[PDB]
UniProtKB/Swiss-Prot annotation, chain B:
The chain holds residues 578 to 761 of 800 of the full protein. This is Endoglucanase. It comes from the Bacteria. It comes from Halalkalibacter akibai (strain ATCC 43226 / DSM 21942 / CIP 109018 / JCM 9157 / 1139). Belongs to the glycosyl hydrolase 5 (cellulase A) family. The lineage of its organism: Bacteria, Bacillati, Bacillota, Bacilli, Bacillales. Alkalophilic Bacillus sp strain 1139 is not a true cellulolytic microorganism because the enzyme is unable to hydrolyze native cellulose.
Length: 179, 184
């Protein structure tokens, strides 16, 4: 049978994953990873979670969130808590990028700046018994091609390899816009 | 500050005529130090020196060198990548990384399109990089085929290259050579 995710639920922000569902989160059709998305505990709260490892954006997990009334408004950032529990992580890095697909902008605008996690610097990261925590914060005020009322349609988060050996489980929680 | 002669915009940019072949600092560049032509790896290259500050602005591009290249009839064509040779000769590089991004400003797409994939250099991995006598050589290759908001004939107007700090202590001289579009 196909991979089966936990129930999808209804798209809501902030996404907190406390109702047993993915609160509208799913794989993008073009995701390089389509493994099971389940709700798992991280740092005392339920979180969206999956496992994967990079060979060898083709190998990159790409999460997707569709919501009809998604607009930037007066928000300046998208933020989320991100946790990693590696089985292997000793070299390279991971780049996290944010994309929206406004129909008025050819179905693609990207937050200009990349959020980078450097696996050679894990012993400097916030951590509890092999669970590493990053407060991912990506500036969306800096997107000039949209206005505050532009219908964004869907948000994608891309987790791309940078010559890493990462393999393990990851967790996403508290996805929200912030001023 | 005195740069070497700007020259005329030529692509591919090989820097063999004693000029910058049209390359300059973007107005928003965080570094505006002398841009000169210097030898790297047996060829002449566009070069500057700088170091990132220890205090990191929350705007992750405020301290980034930003090169800019204006040319008429700047188009992707059937090419899939922008490539260049990038060299670093650090005096300090013990931690962090550098993110290289590529931006064009087509008037038909809001004066801003960006290659989706960042090219990242990890300073913790210098011992694994190609080097000769302290000069590290990276083959920067950035996919532009994946920009869906341009077409092969879209006038791009200008190209900038942003060299952003990722929690690094880099200080030293860098070199850029052989900037071009190329096919997959
Ligand atoms: Ca939660
Ligand atoms: Ca582990
Ligand atoms: Ca040259
Ligand atoms: Ca110091
Ligand atoms: Ca080369
Ligand atoms: Ca040196």
């Amino acid at each position: 049978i196909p991979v089966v995710h936990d129930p999808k639920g209804e798209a809501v922000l902030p996404s907190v994953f406390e109702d047993g569902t993915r609160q509208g989160w799913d794989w993008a059709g073009e995701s390089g990873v389509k493994t099971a998305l389940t709700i798992e505990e991280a740092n005392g709260s339920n979180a969206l979670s999956w496992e994967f490892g990079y060979p060898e954006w083709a190998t990159a997990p790409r999460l997707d969130f569709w919501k009809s009334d998604l607009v930037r408004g007066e928000n300046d950032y998208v933020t989320f808590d991100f946790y990693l529990d590696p089985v292997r992580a000793t070299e390279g890095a991971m780049n996290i990028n944010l994309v929206f697909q406004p129909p008025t902008n050819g179905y693609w605008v990207q937050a200009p700046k990349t959020y980078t996690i450097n696996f050679d610097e894990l012993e400097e990261a916030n951590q509890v018994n092999g669970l590493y925590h990053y407060e991912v914060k990506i500036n969306v005020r800096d997107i000039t091609n949209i206005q505050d009322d532009t219908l964004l349609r869907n948000m994608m988060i891309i987790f791309a390899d940078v010559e890493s050996d990462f393999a393990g489980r990851v967790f996403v929680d508290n996805v929200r816009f912030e001023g």
